[PDB]
Amino acid sequence: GYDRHITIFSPEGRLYQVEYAFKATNQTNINSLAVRGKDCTVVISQKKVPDKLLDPTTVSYIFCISRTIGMVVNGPIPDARNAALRAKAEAAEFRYKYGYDMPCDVLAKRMANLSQIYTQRAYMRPLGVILTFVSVDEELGPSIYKTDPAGYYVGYKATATGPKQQEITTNLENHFKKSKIDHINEESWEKVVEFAITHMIDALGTEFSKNDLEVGVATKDKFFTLSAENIEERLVAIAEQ
Amino acid sequence: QFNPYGDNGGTILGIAGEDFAVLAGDTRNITDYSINSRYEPKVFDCGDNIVMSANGFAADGDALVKRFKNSVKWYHFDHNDKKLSINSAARNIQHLLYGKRFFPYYVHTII
Amino acid sequence: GYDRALSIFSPDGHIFQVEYALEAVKRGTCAVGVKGKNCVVLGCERRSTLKLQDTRITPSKVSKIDSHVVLSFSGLNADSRILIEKARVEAQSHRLTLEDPVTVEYLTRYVAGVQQRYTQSGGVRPFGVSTLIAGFDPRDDEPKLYQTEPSGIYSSWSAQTIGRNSKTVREFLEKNYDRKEPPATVEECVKLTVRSLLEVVQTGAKNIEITVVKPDSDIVALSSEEINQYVTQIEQEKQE
Amino acid sequence: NNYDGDTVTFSPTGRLFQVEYALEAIKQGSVTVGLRSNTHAVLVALKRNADELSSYQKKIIKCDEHMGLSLAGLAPDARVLSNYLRQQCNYSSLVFNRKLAVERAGHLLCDKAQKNTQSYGGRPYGVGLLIIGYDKSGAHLLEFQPSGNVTELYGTAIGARSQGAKTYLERTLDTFIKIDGNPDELIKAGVEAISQSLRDESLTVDNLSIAIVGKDTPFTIYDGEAVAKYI
Amino acid sequence: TGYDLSNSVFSPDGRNFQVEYAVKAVENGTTSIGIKCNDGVVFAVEKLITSKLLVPQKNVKIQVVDRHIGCVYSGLIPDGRHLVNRGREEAASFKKLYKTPIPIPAFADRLGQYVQAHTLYNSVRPFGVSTIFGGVDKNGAHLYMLEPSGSYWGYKGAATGKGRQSAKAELEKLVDHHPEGLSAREAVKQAAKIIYLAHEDNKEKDFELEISWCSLSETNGLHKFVKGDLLQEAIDFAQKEIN
Amino acid sequence: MTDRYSFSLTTFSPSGKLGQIDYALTAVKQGVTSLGIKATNGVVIATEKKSSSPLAMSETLSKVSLLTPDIGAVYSGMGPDYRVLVDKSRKVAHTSYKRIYGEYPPTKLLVSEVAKIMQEATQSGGVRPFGVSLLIAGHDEFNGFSLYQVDPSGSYFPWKATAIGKGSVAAKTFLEKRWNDELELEDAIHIALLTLKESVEGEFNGDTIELAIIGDENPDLLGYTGIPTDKGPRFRKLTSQEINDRLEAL
Amino acid sequence: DRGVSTFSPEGRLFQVEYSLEAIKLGSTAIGIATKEGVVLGVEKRATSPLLESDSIEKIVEIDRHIGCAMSGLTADARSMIEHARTAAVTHNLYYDEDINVESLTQSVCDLALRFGELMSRPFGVALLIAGHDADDGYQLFHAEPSGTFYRYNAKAIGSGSEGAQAELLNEWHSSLTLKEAELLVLKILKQVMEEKLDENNAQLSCITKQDGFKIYDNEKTAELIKELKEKEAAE
Amino acid sequence: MDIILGIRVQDSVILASSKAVTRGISVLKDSDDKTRQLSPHTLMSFAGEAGDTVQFAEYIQANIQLYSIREDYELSPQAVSSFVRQELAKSIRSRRPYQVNVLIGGYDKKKNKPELYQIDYLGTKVELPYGAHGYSGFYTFSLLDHHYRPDMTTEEGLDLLKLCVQELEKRMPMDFKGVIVKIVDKDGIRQVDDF
Amino acid sequence: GSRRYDSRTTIFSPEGRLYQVEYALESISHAGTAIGIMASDGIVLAAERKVTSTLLEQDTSTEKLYKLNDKIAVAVAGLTADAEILINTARIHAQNYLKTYNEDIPVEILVRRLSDIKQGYTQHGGLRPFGVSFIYAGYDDRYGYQLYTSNPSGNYTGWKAISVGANTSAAQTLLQMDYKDDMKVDDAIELALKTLSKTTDSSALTYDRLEFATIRKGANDGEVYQKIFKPQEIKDILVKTGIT
Ligand SMILES: [Cl-]
Ligand SMILES: [Mg+2]
Numbered sequence A: 001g002y003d004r005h006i007t008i009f010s011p012e013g014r015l016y017q018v019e020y021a022f023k024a025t026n027q028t029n030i031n032s033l034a035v036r037g038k039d040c041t042v043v044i045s046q047k048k049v050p051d052k053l054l055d056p057t058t059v060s061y062i063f064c065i066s067r068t069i070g071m072v073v074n075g076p077i078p079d080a081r082n083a084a085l086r087a088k089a090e091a092a093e094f095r096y097k098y099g100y101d102m103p104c105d106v107l108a109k110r111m112a113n114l115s116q117i118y119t120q121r122a123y124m125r126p127l128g129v130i131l132t133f134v135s136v137d138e139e140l141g142p143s144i145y146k147t148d149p150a151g152y153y154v155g156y157k158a159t160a161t162g163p164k165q166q167e168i169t170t171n172l173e174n175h176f177k178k179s180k181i182d183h184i185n186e187e188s189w190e191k192v193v194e195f196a197i198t199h200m201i202d203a204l205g206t207e208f209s210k211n212d213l214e215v216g217v218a219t220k221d222k223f224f225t226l227s228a229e230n231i232e233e234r235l236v237a238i239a240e241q
Numbered sequence B: 001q002f003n004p005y006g007d008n009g010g011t012i013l014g015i016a017g018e019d020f021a022v023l024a025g026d027t028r029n030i031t032d033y034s035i036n037s038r039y040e041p042k043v044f045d046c047g048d049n050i051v052m053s054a055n056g057f058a059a060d061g062d063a064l065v066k067r068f069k070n071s072v073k074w075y076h077f078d079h080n081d082k083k084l085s086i087n088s089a090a091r092n093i094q095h096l097l098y099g100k101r102f103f104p105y106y107v108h109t110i111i
Numbered sequence C: 001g002y003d004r005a006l007s008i009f010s011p012d013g014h015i016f017q018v019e020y021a022l023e024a025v026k027r028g029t030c031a032v033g034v035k036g037k038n039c040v041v042l043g044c045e046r047r048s049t050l051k052l053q054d055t056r057i058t059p060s061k062v063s064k065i066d067s068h069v070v071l072s073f074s075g076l077n078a079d080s081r082i083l084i085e086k087a088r089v090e091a092q093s094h095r096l097t098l099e100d101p102v103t104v105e106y107l108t109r110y111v112a113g114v115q116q117r118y119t120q121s122g123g124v125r126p127f128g129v130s131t132l133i134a135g136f137d138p139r140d141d142e143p144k145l146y147q148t149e150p151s152g153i154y155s156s157w158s159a160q161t162i163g164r165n166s167k168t169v170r171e172f173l174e175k176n177y178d179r180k181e182p183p184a185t186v187e188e189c190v191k192l193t194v195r196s197l198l199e200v201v202q203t204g205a206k207n208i209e210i211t212v213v214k215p216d217s218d219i220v221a222l223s224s225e226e227i228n229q230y231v232t233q234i235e236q237e238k239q240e
Numbered sequence D: 001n002n003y004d005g006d007t008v009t010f011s012p013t014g015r016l017f018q019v020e021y022a023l024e025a026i027k028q029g030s031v032t033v034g035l036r037s038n039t040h041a042v043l044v045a046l047k048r049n050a051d052e053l054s055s056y057q058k059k060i061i062k063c064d065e066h067m068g069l070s071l072a073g074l075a076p077d078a079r080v081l082s083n084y085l086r087q088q089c090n091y092s093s094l095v096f097n098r099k100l101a102v103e104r105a106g107h108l109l110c111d112k113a114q115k116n117t118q119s120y121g122g123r124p125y126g127v128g129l130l131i132i133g134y135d136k137s138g139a140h141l142l143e144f145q146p147s148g149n150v151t152e153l154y155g156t157a158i159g160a161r162s163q164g165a166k167t168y169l170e171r172t173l174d175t176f177i178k179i180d181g182n183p184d185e186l187i188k189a190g191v192e193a194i195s196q197s198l199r200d201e202s203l204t205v206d207n208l209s210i211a212i213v214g215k216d217t218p219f220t221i222y223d224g225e226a227v228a229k230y231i
Numbered sequence E: 001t002g003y004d005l006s007n008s009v010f011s012p013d014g015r016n017f018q019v020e021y022a023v024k025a026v027e028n029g030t031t032s033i034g035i036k037c038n039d040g041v042v043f044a045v046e047k048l049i050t051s052k053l054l055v056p057q058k059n060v061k062i063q064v065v066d067r068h069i070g071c072v073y074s075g076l077i078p079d080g081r082h083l084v085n086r087g088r089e090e091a092a093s094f095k096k097l098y099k100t101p102i103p104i105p106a107f108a109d110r111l112g113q114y115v116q117a118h119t120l121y122n123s124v125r126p127f128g129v130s131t132i133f134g135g136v137d138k139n140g141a142h143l144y145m146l147e148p149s150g151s152y153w154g155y156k157g158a159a160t161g162k163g164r165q166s167a168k169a170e171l172e173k174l175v176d177h178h179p180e181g182l183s184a185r186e187a188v189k190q191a192a193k194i195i196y197l198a199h200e201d202n203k204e205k206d207f208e209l210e211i212s213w214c215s216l217s218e219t220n221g222l223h224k225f226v227k228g229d230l231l232q233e234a235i236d237f238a239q240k241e242i243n
Numbered sequence F: 001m002t003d004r005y006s007f008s009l010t011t012f013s014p015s016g017k018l019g020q021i022d023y024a025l026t027a028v029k030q031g032v033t034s035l036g037i038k039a040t041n042g043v044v045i046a047t048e049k050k051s052s053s054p055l056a057m058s059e060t061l062s063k064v065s066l067l068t069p070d071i072g073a074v075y076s077g078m079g080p081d082y083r084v085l086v087d088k089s090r091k092v093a094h095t096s097y098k099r100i101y102g103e104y105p106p107t108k109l110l111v112s113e114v115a116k117i118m119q120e121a122t123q124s125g126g127v128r129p130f131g132v133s134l135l136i137a138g139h140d141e142f143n144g145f146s147l148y149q150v151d152p153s154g155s156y157f158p159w160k161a162t163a164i165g166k167g168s169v170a171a172k173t174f175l176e177k178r179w180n181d182e183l184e185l186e187d188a189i190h191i192a193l194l195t196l197k198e199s200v201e202g203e204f205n206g207d208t209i210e211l212a213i214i215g216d217e218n219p220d221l222l223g224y225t226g227i228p229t230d231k232g233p234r235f236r237k238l239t240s241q242e243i244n245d246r247l248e249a250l
Numbered sequence G: 001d002r003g004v005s006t007f008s009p010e011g012r013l014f015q016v017e018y019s020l021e022a023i024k025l026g027s028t029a030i031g032i033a034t035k036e037g038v039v040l041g042v043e044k045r046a047t048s049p050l051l052e053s054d055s056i057e058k059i060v061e062i063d064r065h066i067g068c069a070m071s072g073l074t075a076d077a078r079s080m081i082e083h084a085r086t087a088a089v090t091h092n093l094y095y096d097e098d099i100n101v102e103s104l105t106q107s108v109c110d111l112a113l114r115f116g117e118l119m120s121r122p123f124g125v126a127l128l129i130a131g132h133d134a135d136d137g138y139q140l141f142h143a144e145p146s147g148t149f150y151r152y153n154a155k156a157i158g159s160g161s162e163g164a165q166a167e168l169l170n171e172w173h174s175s176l177t178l179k180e181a182e183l184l185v186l187k188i189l190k191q192v193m194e195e196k197l198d199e200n201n202a203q204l205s206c207i208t209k210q211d212g213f214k215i216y217d218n219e220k221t222a223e224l225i226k227e228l229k230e231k232e233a234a235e
Numbered sequence H: 001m002d003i004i005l006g007i008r009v010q011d012s013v014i015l016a017s018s019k020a021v022t023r024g025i026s027v028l029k030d031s032d033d034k035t036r037q038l039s040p041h042t043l044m045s046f047a048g049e050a051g052d053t054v055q056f057a058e059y060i061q062a063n064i065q066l067y068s069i070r071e072d073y074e075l076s077p078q079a080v081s082s083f084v085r086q087e088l089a090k091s092i093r094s095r096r097p098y099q100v101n102v103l104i105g106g107y108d109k110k111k112n113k114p115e116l117y118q119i120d121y122l123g124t125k126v127e128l129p130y131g132a133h134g135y136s137g138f139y140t141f142s143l144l145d146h147h148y149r150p151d152m153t154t155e156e157g158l159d160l161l162k163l164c165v166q167e168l169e170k171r172m173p174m175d176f177k178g179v180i181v182k183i184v185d186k187d188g189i190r191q192v193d194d195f
Numbered sequence I: 001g002s003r004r005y006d007s008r009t010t011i012f013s014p015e016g017r018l019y020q021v022e023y024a025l026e027s028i029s030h031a032g033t034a035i036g037i038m039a040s041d042g043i044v045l046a047a048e049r050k051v052t053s054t055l056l057e058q059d060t061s062t063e064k065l066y067k068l069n070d071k072i073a074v075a076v077a078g079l080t081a082d083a084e085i086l087i088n089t090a091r092i093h094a095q096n097y098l099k100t101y102n103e104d105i106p107v108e109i110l111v112r113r114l115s116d117i118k119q120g121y122t123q124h125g126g127l128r129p130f131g132v133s134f135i136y137a138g139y140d141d142r143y144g145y146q147l148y149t150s151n152p153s154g155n156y157t158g159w160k161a162i163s164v165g166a167n168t169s170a171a172q173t174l175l176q177m178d179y180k181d182d183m184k185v186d187d188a189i190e191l192a193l194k195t196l197s198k199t200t201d202s203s204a205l206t207y208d209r210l211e212f213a214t215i216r217k218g219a220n221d222g223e224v225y226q227k228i229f230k231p232q233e234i235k236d237i238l239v240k241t242g243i244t
Helices: A016-024 A077-098 A104-120 A165-179 A189-204 A228-239 B058-078 B086-098 C016-027 C077-098 C104-117 C166-176 C186-198 C224-238 D017-028 D075-096 D102-118 D162-176 D183-197 D224-230 E017-028 E077-098 E104-117 E164-177 E184-202 E228-242 F019-030 F079-101 F107-120 F168-178 F185-199 F240-246 G014-025 G074-095 G101-112 G161-171 G178-192 G218-233 H052-071 H077-091 H136-147 H154-171 I019-028 I080-101 I107-123 I168-178 I185-199 I231-240
Strands: A032-036 A041-046 A062-064 A070-074 A130-137 A141-147 A153-156 A158-161 A213-219 A222-225 B012-016 B021-025 B029-031 B034-037 B044-047 B050-056 B107-110 C031-035 C040-045 C069-075 C129-135 C144-148 C154-156 C159-162 C208-214 C218-221 D032-036 D040-046 D060-064 D067-073 D127-135 D138-144 D150-153 D155-158 D208-214 D217-222 E032-036 E040-048 E063-065 E069-075 E129-137 E140-146 E152-154 E157-160 E207-215 E223-225 F034-038 F043-048 F065-068 F071-077 F132-140 F144-150 F156-158 F161-164 F209-214 F235-237 G029-033 G038-043 G059-063 G066-072 G125-133 G137-143 G149-151 G154-157 G202-208 G212-215 H004-008 H013-018 H020-023 H026-030 H035-039 H042-048 H100-108 H113-119 H125-128 H130-132 H179-185 H188-192 I034-039 I042-048 I065-067 I072-078 I132-140 I144-150 I156-159 I161-164 I210-216 I225-228
Touching (some): A032 A070, A032 A130, A032 A141, A032 A165, A032 A189, A041 A141, A070 A077, A070 A213, A077 A104, A077 E104, A104 A130, A104 A141, A104 A153, A104 F079, A141 A158, A165 A189, B012 B107, B021 B050, B050 B058, B050 B086, B058 B086, B058 B107, B058 D075, B086 G074, C016 C129, C031 C069, C031 C129, C031 C166, C040 C069, C040 C129, C069 C104, C077 C129, C077 H052, C077 I107, C104 C154, C104 G074, C129 C159, C159 C186, C166 C186, C186 C208, C208 C224, D017 D067, D017 D127, D032 D138, D032 D183, D040 D067, D040 D127, D040 D183, D060 D075, D060 D208, D067 D075, D075 D127, D075 G101, D102 D138, D102 D150, D127 D155, D155 D162, D155 D183, D162 D183, D208 D224, E017 E129, E032 E069, E032 E140, E032 E164, E032 E184, E040 E129, E069 E207, E077 E129, E104 E129, E129 E207, E140 E157, E184 E207, E184 E228, E207 E228, F019 F071, F019 F132, F034 F071, F034 F144, F043 F132, F043 F185, F065 F079, F065 F132, F065 F235, F071 F235, F079 F107, F079 F132, F107 F132, F107 F144, F107 F156, F132 F161, F132 F209, F144 F161, F161 F185, F168 F185, F185 F209, G029 G066, G029 G125, G029 G137, G029 G161, G029 G178, G038 G125, G038 G137, G059 G212, G066 G074, G074 G101, G074 G125, G101 G149, G125 G154, G125 G202, G137 G154, G154 G161, G178 G202, G178 G218, G202 G218, H004 H042, H004 H100, H013 H042, H013 H100, H013 H154, H052 H077, H077 H100, H077 H125, H125 H130, I034 I072, I034 I168, I042 I072, I042 I132, I042 I185, I072 I080, I080 I107, I107 I132, I107 I144, I107 I156, I132 I161, I132 I210, I144 I161, I161 I168, I161 I185, I185 I231
Parallel strands (some): A130 A213
Antiparallel strands (some): A032 A041, A032 A158, A041 A213, A062 A070, A070 A130, A130 A141, B012 B021, B029 B034, B044 B050, B050 B107, C031 C159, C040 C208, C069 C129, C129 C144, D032 D040, D060 D067, D138 D150, D208 D217, E032 E040, E032 E157, E063 E069, E140 E152, F034 F043, F034 F161, F043 F209, F065 F071, F132 F144, F209 F235, G029 G038, G038 G202, G125 G137, G137 G149, G202 G212, H004 H013, H013 H179, H035 H042, H179 H188, I034 I042, I034 I161, I042 I210, I132 I144, I210 I225
């Protein structure tokens, strides 16, 4: 039974090392959510600092890949940073060679193609991570593209990743079934972040302090992460209506 | 164009006696019409009762003497501290010199 | 590159891949070598399980390495071709540098060297081939017959056989071959070689190949009828 | 058990069995003692013969004029590691006109041994070394294990029954450290130390191997009638 | 089963058992700690005196990277040295190209990506060390701890080895009792105490205390070993607290 | 490091079976149904856009891909394996043909190049076979319209019409009854939609069905005028609206 | 399976220990070092009477002042001999002198442990390297596939080794003549050989300072065998 | 090397090649055979830079002898010439090209026809009734153009070749110490020992 | 490390057989039967396509009979993909020889080259062998009309008539029974089709299940023509010989 140790086909036509890499994805016990506004793409992720000896500022699963592209990771931090460094290198090289900023969906495909190679080549193991890339692309506009250890990737209206992804997914599905539009019809990114946090609270059924969340925001020509005080301002607005 | 060679002048003299040998050399180091040093030793004790001087381009001279001294050290290590005979030292130096046949040491060597 | 050590020692001090290579030789069709006083004869078995065979074009069992040396074999046919090619290249390479054709001993020593190399090189299996290398050294009238085997050991033989039922024909040669008086003529040497194969072959039809090598690059392969005359004369003397 | 097939595999308790098996090869090897004062450092090595016709396997190797080691385990591995030390000692002298510090020599041996314990295909070194030397910070004694662990000591012993010699040095620590400017008395202490590791056999003229390096003493090996003085 | 025999193999759990086995080697090692102070960091390690024959203060365990970074580790000492050797190459190539000495967060990822790389293939073994490192850069003091998995975080206090539970409890007290922060000289004293307290898990053999520190005020942001009077003062403070 | 898997992971079993190829074909069997039908004046290739989530934008995932202006490809099996094969197929069409002969390869030769890449994954060191079967439809001046299947083994066969994946056995029987050598492209599209409806459980519309044709030259899709010989691509992907229009005449 | 360079729990390399078992199956080779010269003798052990025994080359010249006898998988020795010959000639080219017998032996033994996953396995052959140099006089060495070499006053390797070595233990003294050594090798070979010893199934050789390395004629050995039989019948 | 001539008559090819080997000031040898037998019925004469000529000639010989053994078959003169041309064509764009010009005189046993091929160091091959390399053609071709007939006997070929050598000995400044003449026919290669 | 997963494709069994070669031959034994018959005035190549469909485009299909040059063709039995790798190598080797010697490659030299490539995969590399057996039908001006076969071992042999693939035992007995040396192409065409018709695992032998080719000096005067039969031409020869 060495068909379960390396990336070769089982008699059922399955790759068990890919399936087990998907299970490593939920090892952090963190839930992420991504939604699209009119002018922005917002990504929120649970932040858990269980040790008091940890510097909480250094605990992050959101990465600034390029000026335009942001990436949240669901999975262990070593594989997350492995994927982050490569994505940054790929984004920089693309700009140098082709003379324009790497689109979100093109980077997603590139990282997915790299993930595919690990599922076909035996000496390389899959990375135990799901990568959610966000940007406001200059052609496609607000963009969410997610990659997994299988080498699969697709564009999303909104998405959720982690142990309780299904509860968040169904919550988002129900909202977009009402509104009958592919985005959050909101002008300011501040209110799109407030929507994202509100619908995670509803789905998970847990309240959040400023230190319990981690927020990334993609606008035209820059992606940036919110400070604890920027999130606090967001949590105050939610509570006041 | 870069010229990798130079002339540091100097003169050396080796005379073989009946039961002795002398290797002499002036201590003047020069370039063109300038004196670099009035005392720059040119004849060296290499151990195993061998004295050696590589006269001409001082850089290539120092390099060759250094590599031979090193060859004496490794001869001891490899062959149970056997004394390197003058004839064996000579044949060894031929291979050091011919090793750079197509980028020679601009030195006339006497041991 | 593939570096896996396939030929390795076992607890009892045996290299099984080399020993299993000999089992491939044991399966191969019987080859025999007999050196007379002024000639060497290479006999080779052709298994009659294959008829409708085109004997014009089918690879012959005896191969010329140079104009004066020949190589027959027992074992894997595909493996033999690689040794024959290497030998033929080394034969011309020797003529080019030494300005003299290879000695039979030198050509043997080379082929044996190649076989040995494949028994302690990474990512390669030994040759499933034993060879009989026969001929005459340049400007020499002394017959030469050598044997090699997958392990890479080689030695000179007054007469030797390799392949399937080689035990039986070696039994025959050991009692029939006199060292003090070897087969004096070509006839006597060919007769003793055909006789030795008839102990094993089955039918003396197209199952026996005979190649006679004489001094000064004089190599000829006997035809069906020429061999058939030897087969006829042997059994008519036996009916007594 | 299932985790001793190669050096690249940790056991469930976080052990490297191929390294521990390499360590075992040292324990099978003949006893060798190292000890130093403030002026001199001494190696004493019990050489092992195959039989009565055979020579006694040399244990001590010279690395430079100011450094050398004694070996216990696979002799060919000791030749590889000593050859590497010779080169590093030589590189320091040629490039920097500088005698290689004994402590730095240890660091280099450690790093060379380590690479063989973390890579597939390779094997650990099957030898332990006692490196003595006199550099710009006085006399030094090092103990090298093929795990990569190098330790600076006053005295030690490695090989079969080495524990006997190691206990003696641990008792004599305060005495032999003070033997300054007396090479003969420091060797006597080393010969008396290795004597605590002998059973059945005793120190004969072709059995005993001694080396010494010090303040005004190049690394010199004593064999044959040269060590009869100390028997 | 058999998922634990080869490195880089996901178990049905989604775990790399070979990395988890490397952690067992770390847990088996001597206690090493790190304390982030006001304007720098302090590193301390427990050195077990196996025998009287060990030359005191000679077998140095803490290693400097560049001139501004200190590294200490618990577990397989050679693996720790191999990682520091790589760290020195990473720090040299960074300074060569970018002129400025490597920032601590930048340096942390260089070690992190390297250790993680040894969990990607079955042809290499994971690192048998947890490394506590850090120093002072342009953005101030930074303390990090790096595990065999390649996982690292920033820390206020860090501990690893056999007496890590004991140490961690002591570090957590300092964090609670000093929210405003700890001075470099205080951190050296506290480091000495914590190693002495964490020595109860290794109480069979007596030990030797080794401390180093980078501090903007005390060492000009350079890594230095705590020697002579300042070391004895920290040993005296530590010995007073256990009694 | 180094790729130390320099040996075959696909080997012959005592029975003469290549296990990893058989298991790759099993992975294809589990894959969503795709089909191809060849008409007199065109070819059609169709498949179901099996959306993993309703939040996912299934327009961004292309199951039917342009390889050259006159050649298109659809698959059944592992999507990621297909995506990298399309990237390699597009490049090899340039490197090993267009950059040599100054024209796009004929359908059969591009198929042959794709087949070769999939064969090598079946014999090369330290790799598994591709877990996909491809249906490649194409037109070239001298061979006309053609439809090819390519299997994980690297084996390829030309078809008049066929289906691969989930409900291939039932689909192929359906095509056998409907196919003749006098079908117009519109008749083939009609049959393609009928055949594909059987294997689809849920929604059946232009948003859940991906369908492309190899038909007449599209000068409107060329992107430039002025060169009479350049008349535009024969590959055209049908829009969500164009499919829905033909589902009313179904 | 398991690594080729793997250590056993006892701290021995499996493949080296297994190669030593292959050498035990080898034909007997004996060396005796005297102050008048070193004698090398081998059992030829022809598998069949049709095998021309003079073609069995188990004693080999490395240089004029160094001979070599082999026991075990004799095919493996060819590359070892080639290296030894090259090393001997190469040193003469570089230093205009003969190479020390120990230095030659050390050069051969450096190949031994160059195996892994370099060659795929250790050598399956042991060598008795006998020679003379000005520094250490007449010398006999035993080169193993472990990479270890011992200097011997007398040594036997192969199938009859431990029986022969016990005999060499009793017989050897520091005052042996070259003629006494020749008979002693012949005596011990005859003892451990399956087939009856003659000049066709056994071979003698010697290395003297004056004449260098010489493989003995079958006629010369035949006389020494006849001299042996008479002196054993003499008491 | 200096003069190499070739003439293809009815039933044979004749190759004349100078005997002189000059190294600058002195004539070192006056009996040099500037030819190699590639196969029993194929001869190749050569002239060009010192060392390269023999090194190339022997290299070709070794290759054709290797083919002969492998296939137990003699390559046609056309096949040998095509091989030689490719080696020279390969050579001209090498780091240091073979500076060697060759005439290949062979008798094709299949077609029962003599064949003469002229190949220069660039790999410029031509089949000719008569050929030369260097300045040899300038003196001789005017005579060959006049006298040559395709139905000439071997004896007539040798007589026309003597007239060519005589014209060279008259008007050439260099003393080439006469020529070694070799005939290639159905019975193989033989040397005319009196010329 | 990686050793754990290595099948070791290039090792001997205790009996002295090559595991992968033997198992590759077992693979080929399930492939469609290919027959070659050599006559005095040409060679015939007949081969059975494996259980086809009514929707397979036969006229543009080729799985059995391939052209190496204008003088040499091959019939394939085994993995079609593996064959096309070797066929492309053989086609290049033929053109390499033509460029070098300005003469068409002799049949045996091409066969030996391909056979030596197959041999390599059994001795070194640690890769699986090519699961292919070839029947080489060719003409050169040395030996004239020649039939050869090569198998995954890299061993090749010459034949007057030979079969590869399924039911070779049954096929070779029928050929050995009805073959004669003075036989002509038209006769050899009939024998080939009659042999397949009896050894086929199918209910009946039809045009859509056959690939057919002839190498004739039936080319106007002193030259050789290759004829890869069209589906309609295979249907005609089936009616002529009286099988349908
Ligand atoms: Cl890509
Ligand atoms: Mg993998």
